Amino acid sequence: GLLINGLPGEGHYSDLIRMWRWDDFLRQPVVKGRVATLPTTGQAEGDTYIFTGSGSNQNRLARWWATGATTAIWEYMPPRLGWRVQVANETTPSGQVKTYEYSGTAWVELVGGMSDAPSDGKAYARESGAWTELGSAAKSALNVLPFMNLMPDMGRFAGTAANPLATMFTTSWTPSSFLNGWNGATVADGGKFAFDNSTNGGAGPALNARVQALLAAMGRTWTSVSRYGVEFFTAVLTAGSQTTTGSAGADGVTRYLCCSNGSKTVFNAGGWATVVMWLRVESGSAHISSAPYTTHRLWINGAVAAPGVVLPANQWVHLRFSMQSYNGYDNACPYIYASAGAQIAFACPAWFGGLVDPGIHVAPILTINGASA
Amino acid sequence: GLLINGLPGEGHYSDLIRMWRWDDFLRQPVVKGRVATLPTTGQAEGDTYIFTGSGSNQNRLARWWATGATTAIWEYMPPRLGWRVQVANETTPSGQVKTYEYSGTAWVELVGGMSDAPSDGKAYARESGAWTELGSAAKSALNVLPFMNLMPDMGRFAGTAANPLATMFTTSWTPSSFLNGWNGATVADGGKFAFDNSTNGGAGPALNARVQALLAAMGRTWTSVSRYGVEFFTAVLTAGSQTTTGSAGADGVTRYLCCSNGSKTVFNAGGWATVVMWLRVESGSAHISSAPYTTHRLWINGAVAAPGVVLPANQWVHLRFSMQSYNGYDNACPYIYASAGAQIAFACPAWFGGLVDPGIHVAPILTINGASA
């Protein structure tokens, strides 16, 4: 509460000039910018800077009045409990004009808002100009949803008779119908990981170099996870001498298909499919697909990748190829071409009947069969 | 920058009346509207229109000052770097008053907002006045999720021994337990679609009229999707002469149940159930359910439908009936009543134990069994 009333009319002309100048300034309260010192040069009429230099003159404005003036002075306008003040020179990307609404102690940003979600524990999302509640499934991710594998042998190459529900299996190696050799490709056993293995102080079968390389790729270095685990076999596919179904990768190197699924009926759910497997190149070179065609999306250890990328040699890689096809079936779904004579190591393949995001899996997904008990 | 200072005191009366009028107007800077021309009639004191006509007087105010005045003139207010100006006559539905914030070059709408999602690749939703992070499953749809059919033979009417994982099957027609004749209804084979069929230039079995009608309905007219596909059988159910379990549709025509599921244990997940199946009426008439009971929702080719709708005759319709029931079982779950003697053609049924939205399917959803290898 301050006041300027009751001026002795002898000094009335000065107050008249005051009423002229302040009223003239009141067209638009705009500040060209905050200044901790009075601009000593380059100022004229219409220039308003917030003089916030240390002292009792904080926030006092510093309009310079020279044009059409007798003597120019830094007129001071002490703000008491300031409020919204517009700013022109700088603005937000969305076109909002910067406005520091002084809350009486600090320069605060302008605020608005019309809708606030009711505090009833339900999440709301905008819909056609109105906020609509969301279900519980929105919060949950996809790496945890327990979907089921379409393989009967889990990729363990032990046959469907083996129980997928058992950590330990005694059945010997057995080829999997889900991986059929192409262009004369030969599939042979590569290795096996045994429960209670002797490599880590046990008495069971030892682990070969490929198994340690995979486990290091898995991050399974701790005893609780490296010294134990679920059993499964590994296989190495040698590309045959046949030269059918040519294709070139991103590097322009031609390669031929080496394996096929035997025309599995996996293209049903909206034509969508998903294949997840772990592989490592022991010799030669290989790539993915032929080139960007139809709808495709490749993830490499959680990183998006493009078709034709040549996978680095002698490293374990996680690939997630998900695409759409209304044809209802396909025999060459992987679209993976490898150079003749290339030794490719793979383990724990995982296929799904649609788009799923299970993350970087560690073991094949389970299912139920007659031998599952 | 401009000023009105330091006038010769002789003429101070004019500019004092000036500042008086401007101060009087400054109670609320409101414009009744924007005008490209000065209103020549029907204006008085308190009327303010933004004179934005072509010329240098753009955005100049056009307040008419006649009441209690010697001579009325269109006092002009050239705006320099305009700002928030309120508008009264028209307002938004949510009670927000229109305000054209002039950004110095155009009339910009007033803006607010207090919360912005952090830029860290995460999607947030309002929750109890705070923005809460959403999961990955929220973005994903429901038509691609690879759920499981509860049918062992996929509706192919070839028996459970037939491998669901094979595109082609050699087994002959076989009745499906999931469909059971009611009121003396008889179920007979109607047709079959064969891989490498001769109708499209092949050497396999030909396709009868029903198959072409279905394929045209499915939209699978291209060679890649019409000349190839997964095999399955079609069956036609003839309503029996029995008149038990009467019901009336939306058109008021009484009908009787013709088929039953044999009391399947599908009402488990919260009592929810879902039935998806393709059908076509060859004779007679039929409708869905009896009358609105409990919770229900019918989708016809993706279009919501109400109980009792009489399906058009001789057309393929995609039905998705979903409801809830805590009883734990039901034998007449479809609640489909057809007139006596009506010939109904159906193919590729699919059932689920809960609410799912796979869209308009083109083939029965897969499962796993002993013969799946």
Place this chain on the structure above:
Amino acid sequence: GLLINGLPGEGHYSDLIRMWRWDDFLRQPVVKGRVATLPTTGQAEGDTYIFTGSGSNQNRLARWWATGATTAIWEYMPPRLGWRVQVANETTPSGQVKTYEYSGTAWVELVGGMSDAPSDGKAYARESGAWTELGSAAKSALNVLPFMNLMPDMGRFAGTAANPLATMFTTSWTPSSFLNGWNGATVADGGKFAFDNSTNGGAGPALNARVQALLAAMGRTWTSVSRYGVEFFTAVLTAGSQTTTGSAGADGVTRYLCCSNGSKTVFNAGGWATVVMWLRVESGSAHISSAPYTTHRLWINGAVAAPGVVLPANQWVHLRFSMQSYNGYDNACPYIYASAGAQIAFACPAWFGGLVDPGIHVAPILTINGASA
């Protein structure tokens, strides 16, 4: 529309007094608060209250002008179509300063907003400063999704040969491999619920006290849900005399493990697991887990619970223990320790391969096997 122009040059000293008052007062149009009566005491210069008392004097300001003044009067400021007026003393939690924008008939709140979801049927959420559309799965809940159980016998203790798809079964009681006795614990048949039971006016086997207790806990008291249902057995486990694998609950009472899963391979989906089962304590005491370890979350009938909570004796409780473990397997997954000699009743166990939220289930979740047909 109003003006203060017309007046003689005689009595305009009051007019300029008012020009010195209004202009200086309009530094910031702030009101200390709304008042229905003029403050008769404790007011001075700088105090502004909205005099909103009943009558034609509504909304008029009541600034008291006494300091440096001759005689103080309640200057009145009739608002015509008022607008945004800031308020200082009270503010919103988010730092927003209260502002009652008068819409000409009522005191409305200030409004903002820079984004509105397009009206095209898609739900949008904020993402890195932009609104991104959401999928259909976001709206759906999780209690309804039809996920598949991993138990081959449904927990009915009837053997895998029994068809889970049939409401009724004729096979006798059979132990379940999923529940293996530990510390010498003995598992014995406890009861069975029969379709068309005679307890509710039928002719089938009667129901024992445990079954009525479970049904009352389940809420299935109506005839449609109490007199009818799916068949299943119940078993009672008696803690053995062995004292291996000691553990203490939240109350500090030591207990020992009484059952094990036989090292089932369920920790596959990101190491996540979910166990749901109904139990009732007939004698002794029991608790959950040993102490908070790693990640954990327990729901008791939909209510979150902490490790070690001693379940009330002789009551049915719905438990849902979900935890992550990357080891890939575990034999003592339940982590349930019961006092020696405690008689624990349990029925309809349900396990899943990952985090799922089926709510309070009423029957075991179904699966598919060779005998499912």
